[PDB]
C-alpha cells in the first residue's frame, strides 16, 4: 500500500551528510527511465533537486550549489536509488521526494506517475528535550480553554482531551519552531461557560521520542 | 525564475462548481498538473498538457493558450479540494489552493495569561486564539504598555474544518519574568474583514 | 539487455557543410543531445609498455571543433558555452570507452572537455595526452608495442539543468544509450 518504498525520516546535524533511499520491484523498475529527486520545505513549493538514469547511470541537478553536494546513484541489480547531501544546512530543511519517469519521447514533456511518500530532513543541532505542558485556564456563553506544549524536540505530539470523550471544538493547532532550537504548540476547546464548573478538563499530551506521557488538568483559578 | 508563474494562488469554491487553474510557462513545451494533498505524494492527473492518466475520471482536462496553460476541474467534489502544481519539464509552478467558499465569520477572539506554573520556570508566554473565521486571512498585534510589540510573537493557522469550512488562528507573545514584571497593561488587538472595528482583548497583570 | 554508450562517437557518418544538433526536443536536459562533425577527428591510441597506454589527439585541430560546436550551440541559446566533465555515471560515460586490437581501452577526456567559449569571436581561457588505461580483471596485462588508430565522427553531450544555473550554458558528454 503501495511502491516506490522511501527511508525514515531524519534529525540531522548542520554540516553532516544524510543517505536517503528509494526502492521499488523488478517489474516497476526495468519500466523507469528516471529517477527525479524533488523537495518542499513546509510553506514552500515542490523543488527538483535533479535526476538519475535507471540504466547508465548519469546525473543533472537544478543549481550549481546541487551539484557539488548531492550525489545521485542507483543499483540496477536490486533495483534501488540513493541520494547523498553533503554540507547540511537549516536550509535542507524538507521534506524529500522521488519520483518515477516511464521511458518517454521526447517533447511530451516531464511526468512523473509514481512517487514516494516521502522523507523528511530536519537540520537540527538541538537534542531530544521533554516538553513542558502548561494551562490555558477561561475567566459570554462560550468559554475557550487549552493546553501550551512549551520547548519540545523532535515532532510529533499527540495531542488528546479527555481521553478521546472530547472532540467537538476541538483546535489543535501545528508545533512553531523558535528562537530556541524547541517547537511549541497550544492545543484549544470550546465549550459552554456553563459546563466548566461540573465537567473536568484534562488533556492528553504524549510526547513519544522522550517518552512522556503528560495528562494536565485546566479549571478556572484566580 | 522568469518563466512558470501560476495563478490564482487560492481558489474559493462551492461543490459543483467548476475550478479553472492557470499556469503561464514563458515557452511553448507541453504542461502536466498534479494533484497534492497536506502530507500525501504528489497525484499525477494530468500529462502532454491535454492528457489525463490511467485511474483520473472525466471532471479533469487540461487546455492551452499560448502561454496560458490551464486545467479545469468540471462538477466538483469535495475529495478535489486541495493544492495543485504544474510543472513544465523541470520547472513547477508556485502553487495554488482550492478551499470550500462559504458565508464570511467573524473570528472569537479569547486572550490567555502566562500560567504560575510557567512564571515558576523563568518564561512568560501570553497566548491569544481566534476562533472559527473565513477568510483565512485575519491579522494580530500585540500591545504592551501601548506600544506596538513585533519581532517577539510567533503564528500558527490550523487547516480548514470539514464540518463548518472556518479556519482559526493562534498567536504567542514570549517574554522573560523579568520584562514582564515591568509593564501592567498586555493588550492583543485583531483586524479582520469580519470586523467593521477592531477587536482589543486585554487584562490587568497579577489580578483575579 | 547489454550496454551501450560513450563520450566520442567513432567511424560513422559525417556532416555534408555545417556541424548538426540532433535530438528529440533539445530543451529538454534528459533528452541526450547528438553532436555531428564536419571534418573528422582522428585519434590515435599507443600501448608501448607495462603500463603506460595513451591516447593523442590534435589541439589545433580540437580548439578549431570544439569553438565551431560553441558557434552552433549558440543557434539554440545565443549565450556564453561551458565544455565541461560529467559529475556521474558508469566508466562508459565518464571514460571514452572502446575496445582496441583485443584489449578494451578507458580513458579520461578532462583535457578535451574543460573550456568556456565566449559570446563574441569565440575565445579560450587565457598537444592533448589522454592518460587511458586497460582492464586488468581478465587478465595480466599484454607488452608493447600496440597502436590503435579511428576516427572521431560525432560527440553525445547532456545539457545542465535549472534556472538558478544563469550566465553561461554547460554541456557534459555521456548520455544517453543509443545512436542516430
Ligand atoms: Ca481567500
Known amino acids: 500500500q503501495v511502491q516506490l518504498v522511501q527511508s525514515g525520516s531524519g534529525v540531522k546535524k548542520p554540516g553532516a551528510s544524510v543517505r536517503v533511499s528509494c526502492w521499488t520491484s523488478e517489474d516497476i523498475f526495468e519500466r523507469t527511465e528516471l529517477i527525479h529527486w524533488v523537495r518542499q520545505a513546509p510553506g ?32 540496477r541489480d536490486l533495483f534501488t536509488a540513493h541520494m547523498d547531501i553533503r554540507g547540511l544546512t537549516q536550509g535542507d530543511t524538507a521534506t524529500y521526494f522521488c519520483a518515477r519517469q516511464k521511458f518517454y519521447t521526447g517533447g511530451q514533456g516531464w511526468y512523473f506517475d509514481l512517487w514516494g511518500r516521502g522523507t523528511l530532513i530536519v537540520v537540527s543541532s538541538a537534542s531530544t528535550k521533554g516538553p513542558s505542558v502548561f494551562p490555558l485556564a477561561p475567566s459570554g456563553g462560550t468559554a475557550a480553554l487549552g493546553c501550551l506544549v512549551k520547548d519540545y524536540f523532535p515532532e510529533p505530539v499527540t495531542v488528546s482531551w479527555n481521553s478521546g470523550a472530547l472532540t467537538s471544538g476541538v483546535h489543535t493547532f501545528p508545533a512553531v519552531l523558535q528562537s530556541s532550537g524547541l517547537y511549541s504548540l497550544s492545543s484549544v476547546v470550546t465549550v459552554p461557560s456553563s459546563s466548566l464548573g461540573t465537567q473536568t478538563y484534562i488533556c492528553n499530551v504524549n510526547h513519544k ?14 | 525564475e522568469i518563466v512558470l508563474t501560476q495563478s490564482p494562488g487560492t481558489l474559493s469554491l462551492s461543490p459543483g462548481e467548476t475550478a479553472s487553474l492557470s499556469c503561464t510557462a514563458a ?78 465569520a467573524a473570528p472569537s477572539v479569547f486572550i490567555f495569561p502566562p500560567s ?15 476562533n472559527n473565521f473565513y477568510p483565512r486571512e485575519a491579522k494580530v498585534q500585540w500591545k504592551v504598555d501601548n506600544a506596538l510589540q513585533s519581532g517577539n510573537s510567533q503564528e500558527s493557522v490550523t487547516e480548514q474544518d470539514s464540518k463548518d469550512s472556518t479556519y482559526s488562528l493562534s498567536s504567542t507573545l514570549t517574554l522573560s519574568k523579568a520584562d514582564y514584571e515591568k509593564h501592567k497593561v498586555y493588550a492583543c ?15 490587568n497583570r497579577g489580578e483575579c | 539487455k547489454p550496454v551501450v554508450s560513450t563520450q566520442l562517437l567513432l567511424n560513422g557518418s559525417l556532416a555534408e557543410k555545417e556541424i548538426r544538433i540532433k535530438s528529440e526536443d533539445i530543451s529538454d536536459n534528459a533528452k541526450n543531445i547528438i553532436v555531428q562533425l564536419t571534418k573528422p577527428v582522428l585519434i590515435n591510441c599507443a600501448r608501448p609498455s607495462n603500463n603506460t597506454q595513451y591516447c593523442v589527439v590534435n589541439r589545433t585541430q580540437w580548439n578549431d571543433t570544439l569553438g565551431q560546436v560553441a558557434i552552433q550551440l549558440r543557434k539554440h541559446w545565443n549565450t556564453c558555452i561551458i565544455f565541461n566533465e560529467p559529475s556521474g555515471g558508469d566508466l562508459e560515460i565518464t571514460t571514452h570507452s572502446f575496445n582496441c586490437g583485443g584489449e578494451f581501452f578507458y580513458c579520461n577526456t578532462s583535457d578535451l572537455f574543460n573550456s568556456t567559449w565566449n559570446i563574441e569571436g569565440t575565445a579560450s581561457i587565457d598537444d592533448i595526452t589522454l592518460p587511458c588505461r586497460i582492464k586488468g580483471s581478465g587478465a595480466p596485462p599484454i607488452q608493447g608495442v600496440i597502436r590503435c588508430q579511428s576516427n572521431i565522427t ?27
Open chain 1, 44 to 75: 514552500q513549493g515542490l523543488e527538483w533537486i535533479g535526476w538519475v538514469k535507471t540504466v547508465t547511470g548519469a546525473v543533472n541537478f537544478g543549481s550549481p550549489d546541487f551539484r557539488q553536494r548531492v550525489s545521485l546513484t542507483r543499483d
Open chain 1, 209 to 222: 521520542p522522550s517518552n512522556t506521557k503528560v495528562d494536565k488538568k485546566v479549571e478556572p483559578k484566580s
Open chain 2, 27 to 104: 515557452s511553448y513545451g507541453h504542461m502536466t498538473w498534479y494533484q497534492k494533498k497536506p502530507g500525501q505524494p504528489p497525484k499525477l492527473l494530468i500529462f502532454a498538457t491535454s492528457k489525463r492518466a490511467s485511474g483520473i475520471p472525466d471532471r479533469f482536462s487540461g487546455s492551452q493558450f499560448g502561454k496560458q496553460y490551464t486545467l479545469t476541474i468540471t462538477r466538483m467534489e469535495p475529495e478535489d479540494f486541495a493544492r495543485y502544481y504544474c510543472q513544465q519539464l523541470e520547472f513547477f509552478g508556485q502553487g495554488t489552493r482550492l478551499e470550500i467558499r462559504r458565508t464570511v
Open chain 2, 116 to 130: 504560575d506554573e510557567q512564571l515558576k520556570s523563568g518564561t512568560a508566554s501570553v497566548v491569544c486564539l481566534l
Open chain 2, 189 to 203: 488587538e485583531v483586524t479582520h474583514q469580519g470586523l467593521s472595528s477592531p477587536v482589543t482583548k486585554s487584562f
Open chain 3, 154 to 180: 560525432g560527440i553525445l553531450l547532456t545539457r545542465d539543468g535549472g534556472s538558478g544555473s544563469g550566465t553561461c550554458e554547460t554541456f557534459r558528454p555521456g548520455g544517453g544509450d543509443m545512436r542516430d
